[PDB]
Design a binder for this molecule. Structure first.
Ligand code: MA4
Ligand code: SA2
Length: 265
């Protein structure tokens, strides 16, 4: 592989789209690679990690319990609800909803949780409270994935998203147990986790949440590192490319390969 930045550039040339990327040490926040890190990108389903961070904050404050069962109706469901469709009769716990949102990208689960934190405005207020003044949620699932050009709704920047994920996982803003829970949800991703492991060299840790949207929007927020450690946050977004889903996946994987091959920086 070329160096990471050279590969990121190559991916833009090949996609005819914008890539936004940051590689950050999880423990310290050291930024190693940054490319369009201050430009806006649609979050897509990656917002689900911040959503569950807001849920966990409520749990820590005693205003929520992960055990609490929510009993929803079919009229409450949106597109792609693989877990939530199964539990119309018996409901799902708040924690089960988080797991379905993060590990399966269950959209109805994300919307039920969104309501509990005061909707998109409530989540945005949470982000401002942890000092993210850039990331914003404006819409519910599934409309938040629309990715219109020039539209600032439902966007983050690589730098903001990385800093916010670090705050949630490590800053002791969340309780120790809640930090551990958010991490485990990302470790348990079923959408991309097992596939990524299948192509990672032995010894490499992965945890992740992915997203996809219109106009080629694609993204991943991930923890990655050798020696089976979550050494770094890697955030990659793509926007405004006409490329196939397969090609977008391959280009992100190629950036990952360049990181792996040239890890010691
Ligand atoms: O010298 C480093 C390594 O080089 C190769 O590993 C390859 C691997 O065989 C390939 O499957 C992967 O593709 C990249 C797959 C990455 C998957 C997505 C990564 C995510 C992770 C977090 C966010 C960014 C994207 O590249 C690495 C590095 O060349 C060798 O196979 C391996 O034995 C060796 O230890
Ligand atoms: C979040 O990123 C959602 C992506 N698109 C979904 C949506 O708009 O609700 C779809 C329903 C596709 O969803 C999936 O394939 C699940 C995995 C999405 C992910 O990467 O997390 S839409 O039909 O594209």
């Amino acid at each position: 592989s070329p160096q990471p930045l050279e590969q990121i550039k190559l991916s833009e040339s090949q996609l005819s789209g914008r890539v936004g990327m940051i590689e950050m040490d999880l423990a310290s926040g050291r930024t190693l690679t940054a490319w369009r890190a201050d430009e806006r990108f649609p979050m897509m389903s990656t917002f689900k990690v911040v959503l569950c961070g807001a849920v966990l904050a409520r749990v820590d404050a005693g205003d929520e319990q992960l055990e609490r069962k929510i009993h929803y109706r079919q009229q409450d469901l949106v597109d792609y609800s693989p877990v939530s469709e199964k539990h119309l009769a018996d409901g799902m716990t708040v924690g089960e909803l988080c797991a379905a949102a993060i590990t399966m990208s269950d959209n109805s689960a994300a919307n039920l949780l969104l309501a509990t934190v005061g909707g998109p405005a409530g989540l945005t207020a949470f982000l401002r409270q942890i000092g993210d003044n850039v990331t914003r949620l404006d819409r519910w699932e599934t409309e938040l994935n629309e990715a219109l050009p020039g539209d600032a709704r439902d966007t983050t920047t690589p730098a903001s998203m990385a800093a916010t994920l670090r705050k949630l996982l490590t800053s002791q803003r969340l309780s120790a147990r809640s930090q551990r829970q958010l991490l485990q949800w990302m470790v348990d991703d079923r959408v991309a986790g097992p596939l990524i492991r299948s192509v990672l060299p032995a010894g490499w840790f992965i945890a992740d949440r992915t997203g996809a949207g219109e106009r080629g929007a694609r993204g991943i927020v991930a923890l990655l590192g050798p020696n089976n450690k979550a050494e770094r946050i890697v955030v990659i977004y793509l926007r405004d490319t006409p490329a196939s889903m397969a090609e977008r996946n391959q280009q992100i994987a190629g950036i990952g390969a360049a990181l792996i091959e040239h890890w010691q920086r």
